[PDB]
Ligand binder design. Structure first.
Ligand code: HEM
Ligand code: HEM
Lengths: 480, 480, 480, 480
């Protein structure tokens, strides 16, 4: 051979010169190698994720160290179970070339390759989110992206959405605090955010929240430092993770759950299924489950990280979803996006395959790498291929009763938009954090927010906390 | 488990009932299994080939039984070489549901999995074709498909194109003869049609034609029988091949070449590179090469036959293309179609992979199943990955000299549109075949061909042969 | 200019000859016109529909001639309303090249371009269907397509599915009767099949069934005649419709509904929402609504018929869906398929556009022809773009109560699999139809159905009717 | 209506709440509006360009102010002709979220909507480029992107490619100089870079180079300032252009050509077709043509800028390509990329349409918005649709003669890799620019370039200029 091949394994002849009529002559159409190489180059790029385009990740293990079999029969969470996993970390709004150290929510997405199928826990570095109904999510995300005429991101539009959707106040307070700028992914926490269901061997159900506490400690950038890093190294977080693992400094997290019995879900004074609400640690203490460690870098970023497909719909026996409407919307959206972003057969790619046998009634489609040979193509066949036919109530379901409506959740006695961020600002933050909050928010509002949105923003922050709100308004008036 | 899985390997729970609020209630959005199954079902279908949508095939072997090393160094054609192969047979114009036994050219497409890469010989059941320049091919194919308003195939349009492009007369005569209706694919011949180049170890070049003679004998349907079969069994040819191989009746062909030394290409009195011309057997006798046998049915029609990608550009050392402009156009077109029909990474699918190592500078793209890990991504790297850099004349090239033109080929003394089909009609056909020709052509012309095309058609057939032409005109006038 | 252009409007120079180095020379890569023409040719074909690939259609009008405002406020069904419409007719199982006159269900899909949006009524030429839960639909359709190894359709697989799913007996009886072979689309009826909801101005709800009775009369082919036509003219139905309209023989149908008050849905002795059940005409008589006439052929089959996108989810005020689980599954599936088959922005294509203004929060995507300029990209904006925010019960909803289950419908006193087809066979069919039924079914069962499916089929037909069942079994034993 | 619609024009009902079973209940599958909105959101993103993903643009006019009819008959370049145009500016290597103010080549891509078709002049802010054969372009671009394992950009890989391809020295010197960091797009020049052909009414041919000189003056950032801006405003250039035009500060450029008669192309002592070479202004002075002004911002960035498709193959009468092999490779590559990035029918999108009538033989394809009705689908039709059939030499062609080779260009007496950048460094740069060059290059080489590439880089810079090379080596050794 000549040192390289075409896609058919024939000699390439040259990777440096095209086929021409004489050394100074024109290129010939039948330079097959040139055409193949250039056409493939022209198709190297694929749609990025929407949202969470900019991200990176690593492989690792999960080890369940404590006994939670009272609450779940899920195989990966039985004491002593070790499971291989993949993690991807990301920002939300920026595109795939955007700086890592912008102020944003960070994704914390996990795929566990369990003995009963792949389980995805697609979390964030925050326990809450901005909105309560998935119909609002495209609107929220577009408000965080670019203006339709100029292609510029816009503070005015962001605050327009947030102030018109005051359910956002809890997450906006968390985001505008110090946790909006994690120094590295190794120095941030992860959360499931939503309530999920755990189901034990007896079929008893629990509402759970997942918490992932970093063993490396929480660390932050200030606004100034993050801005400087965005200019110095747009890939600071990606580099940090890859370099840490490459030198054997394997980051770890402890996973712990809050656990609420099924029946208490009905009566708790805060809506347990409202994604804008945390569960007070005094009412529901953390119960330790196990240890997540990341210890292996990808060998191929594109094939293993870019093409990884996670979905909260990918539950395993012992785990279910919950009445959080946002979670139910996510159950649809992820696979739908992946069929477009990756392809019809994205589940067949190595990173997305489970470690257990698959017998699923999916056939054909573009780029079908795997097939079931001559096996029957339909359930209720007489040809020897099994199918599933469980009837009646599912183990991980609940119940519903009502007219078909488009409505907000029923408010419980403890439910409102501003009490939980008020507590964050007054009781959890210290004085240094309150100072940084005022400097962050006033900075954002001075970045082009106009009337009448600007005045609505003052009122929003005064609703969170009268003092801090007045300080923000003063800093903005001063800066004008 | 429950008898089947999702794509993540988790239990499916049911392949028969959707998740609802009570047994009579509505379906819930978070029925992930339902969504996955239905969305994949919605994407099972892919674009069919254009042309040659309707087809089937089988795997087999090629054994080179004679010594042709005087003419080619190609590994698969060295005496004693055995090579695994794939064949696909097809019609040209009909869509994927169309009857097998319509009058049409049949494709005879071969992929040889050689020790120096995959070699594709994408032939037809005819030694010639309808046009001489690839710019005309889309026009020809559209004339053979459906009218733009009604969606109906139309004899008028077909004859409009053919009579305006009298270069078509040779192939149209072959097609309207008995060979237009092969009884099965096992009972038809195959040809390369084009002149190809063979190159021996010393670098001497030959112009070759490939011929594949059926060991089962030539057999035909009449117009009436083929029409009846189109109604009784639209998949007659596909069934015939699959059933023959399944009962151990393995079809075979002998491959033989005509061989013309490079220099004789310049002086031969017929243009050797004109796809509308055969080479007289008296001037260039057949030289036997080897035996093609098909002996294994596909295990999965979609994955192995529907997704097979052949290209005449897929040559191997010892074989090249030729000055036939049609062949040079094909070198571009096939891979271009496959990137759309199958996907960017179609070369990675099992049926399309070679049996030899691949080191090619293609990266990423949608549905990338295989990757080169951390290997260098560019040629002239210092990272240990080889590349190709042969300079100067390629072993399988020729030469050119001229202004850039859009022009017909230079006519040689023996070149014209009507002499070779005249000989077919007068000397090769017997009286029974001439009778069937007249009944075929008059039938086609009575199927809706209008003035002024109808009169041009009479003249076309009189140009092929004055007598037969007059008989066709009489049969049409009688039928009117 | 030269007589034609490139896609940029520059002169094409030639549509007949490629750019070469001299008249006998090779083709140059920079023949842009050749590349553009050939690459577009290579992408002319698109995925066909699954199912209902083979079809055609026409434009027309709907005129509401009677007063049904007591039952619906829908604008197109107010007395005197005329609405432009599109109809597409089709078979179910065959691919886009398959003969029109195969035994099959026919689609009867209508799009009404109303003053309150496009309303699609995607019906069939039958009032019932084969299965009751949409999870079974992909399985059913695959059983009606091709075997995975050979690519052949298979009676064994079809009867395997049907006999394992005896809910199918009503539709299988209708299909195997004379209506399985309509002579033309103009000579067949259409039905909504499902129960839909109508809602009047006061907000009172009715369950309705749609019926479309041909003004041309019902006409059929026998098995023998349909088979012969499949061989003589694979496009017989398409040609028939196009030619009828072209000569001014405009086909018409009368639309009439059956109307059941909301509350009677709860108590009727047959499940009104079971797609395998008709509503007896004695209990619910037909109420005339209006006249459908088709009076205009497409000008471009591909652009107007092939790219037409219908969805039962496309309701308009005054019309809703129903507790039929099959209908709820369809509400998801059609748009999902269309995003793949046509594209992200299929709703922007002319045939799919409404005749009323659109203000929808959809942005960007591949091939975005229309855009909203600089308008706000999110709801709850302060930028002057309106959004929708109706809260509470929707006018076209119902109610549900229960645990989350995967279960069959609750059987009502009149519900079973075999009573309605029994009545069809014994009371509706005459002796000639019973004879044709026995000859149809025995023919199908002799076409390769094997034990143990063949014996299950005898029992199935005996369950429909003991006599006819015994006659089928005798005809099969005789034919063996 | 309710304030907004679905894609069918029916009322949306809500853009804020999904359809659920009671206010606290689960989401129903048949929430069509939710599905449509979310599925479209999931498909908003498309593949970015490769390269030149990050960019923006504006509309304007071109006015030809001088008489160049002695050299070209092209309609847009006749004296007094005004033409609407679109410009897009971009970086090369970064993705769509990447900072505008990275060191890079800038694209300067123009589309002129002329009276004889759309003419694209796809230039850069440099008159030269890095490589001479298009086979090397994918390799070059990948060396400028990310490592395959870590996903990080890498100086080592960049210098590995450049030092192994010393033809790169001219452009690398230009890029590492002050012009690598334009302060805004309004303050940079544009060039065609390649030699193009101009053809006058008599058919006489000229080799031309295009030059676009900014009326705003050349302005730069230092390394430090550009880095700071990357952190402060990743969209600085996009914002600058949009804001300038919005306040009526319309940027302008003067276009001038260098003009070489056809015959001098053969004998000039520098290869006129080598993309790494400029033509000395003393030998070929600039001849003024006209004025480019940008005076209108996009109304929709996605629809008008993101989906704009430019190709150097889009020539118009009076303009042709040239023997630059890089240009001939580009003639293929752009449309090929656009069929994937945008779609089969990208030429139909408003921004890509010409202002003149189109009669082109392209049909169907996904998302076909425009069609030719019932018009004939093939050239040489008797149906009244014209086609093109010019034969013989094309007006904008040249000639070739030789064997088929893969070879570098023949070196002319003045040709080498290092003389032109030597002159740039010694004669054009001043002392301040030489200082910045040394600080730029040493900075790049200290950013992770390893042996043996680092030593090859010292030699490369010493080949450009012995002194400056020694200064770079000293700065690197000092920094180590
Ligand atoms: C209704 C609300 C939401 C919708 C509709 C939604 C939808 C999406 C979609 C479509 C993607 C891209 C998927 C792909 O292309 O592979 C995505 C990614 C992601 N989402 Fe969500 N999302 C929602 C809320 C949330 C919440 C609440 C969290 C965290 C608790 C979250 C965390 C993420 C993460 C981490 C990713 C990136 C996953 C990865 O690394 O590939 N999202 N989301
Ligand atoms: C310039 C003329 C021609 C052009 C542009 C052309 C182009 C094409 C294209 C684009 C396909 C579909 C490829 C795919 O989707 O995989 C095809 C298939 C095919 N062509 Fe050609 N073709 C030409 C002439 C011919 C000739 C002369 C022959 C035979 C000697 C031939 C034999 C076939 C066969 C057998 C197939 C089907 C291959 C298979 O089974 O997959 N074509 N052609």
């Amino acid at each position: 051979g000549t040192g390289s091949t075409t896609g058919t394994g024939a000699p390439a002849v040259s990777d440096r010169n095209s086929l021409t009529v004489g050394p100074d002559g024109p290129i010939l159409l039948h330079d097959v190698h040139f055409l193949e190489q250039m056409a493939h180059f022209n198709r190297e790029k694929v749609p990025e994720r929407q949202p969470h385009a900019k991200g990176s990740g690593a492989f690792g293990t999960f080890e369940t160290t404590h006994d939670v079999s009272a609450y779940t029969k899920a195989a990966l969470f039985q004491k002593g179970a070790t499971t291989e996993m993949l993690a991807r970390f990301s920002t939300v709004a920026g595109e795939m070339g955007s700086p890592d150290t912008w102020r944003d929510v960070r994704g914390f997405s996990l795929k566990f390759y369990t003995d009963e199928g792949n389980y995805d826990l697609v979390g964030n570095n925050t326990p809450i989110f901005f909105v309560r109904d998935p119909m609002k999510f495209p609107h929220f995300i577009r408000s965080q992206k670019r203006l339709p005429d100029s292609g510029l991101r816009d503070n005015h539009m962001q605050w327009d959405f947030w102030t018109n959707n005051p359910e956002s106040a809890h997450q906006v307070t968390y985001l505008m605090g110090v946790r909006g700028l994690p120094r590295t992914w190794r120095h941030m926490n992860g959360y499931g955010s939503h309530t999920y269901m755990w189901v034990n061997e007896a079929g008893e159900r629990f509402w759970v929240k997942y918490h992932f506490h970093t063993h490396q400690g929480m660390e932050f950038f200030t606004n100034e430092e993050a801005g400087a890093m965005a200019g110095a190294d747009a890939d600071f977080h990606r580099r940090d993770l890859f370099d840490a693992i490459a030198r054997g400094e394997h980051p770890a997290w402890t996973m712990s759950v809050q656990v609420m019995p099924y029946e208490e879900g009905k009566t708790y004074h805060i809506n347990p299924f409202d994604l804008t609400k945390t569960w007070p640690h005094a009412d529901y203490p953390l119960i330790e489950v196990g240890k997540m460690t990341l210890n292996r870098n990808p060998e191929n970023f594109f094939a293993q990280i870019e093409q990884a497909a996670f979905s909260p719909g990918n539950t395993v026996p012992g785990i279910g979803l919950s009445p959080d409407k946002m979670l139910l919307g996510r159950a649809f959206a992820y696979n739908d996006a992946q069929r477009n972003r990756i392809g019809t057969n994205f589940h067949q790619l190595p990173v997305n395959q489970p470690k257990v046998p698959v017998n699923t009634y999916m056939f054909d489609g573009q780029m079908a790498y795997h097939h079931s040979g001559s096996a029957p193509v339909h359930a209720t066949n007489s040809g020897g291929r099994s199918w599933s036919d469980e009837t009646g109530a599912v183990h991980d379901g609940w119940e519903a009763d009502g007219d078909f409506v488009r409505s907000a959740y029923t408010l419980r006695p403890g439910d409102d938009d501003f009490s939980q961020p008020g507590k964050l600002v007054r009781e959890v933050f210290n004085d240094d954090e309150r100072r940084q909050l005022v400097e962050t928010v006033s900075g954002a509002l001075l970045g082009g927010v106009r009337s009448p949105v600007l005045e609505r923003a003052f009122d929003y922050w005064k609703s969170v906390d009268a003092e801090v709100g007045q300080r923000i308004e003063d800093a903005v008036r001063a800066g004008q």
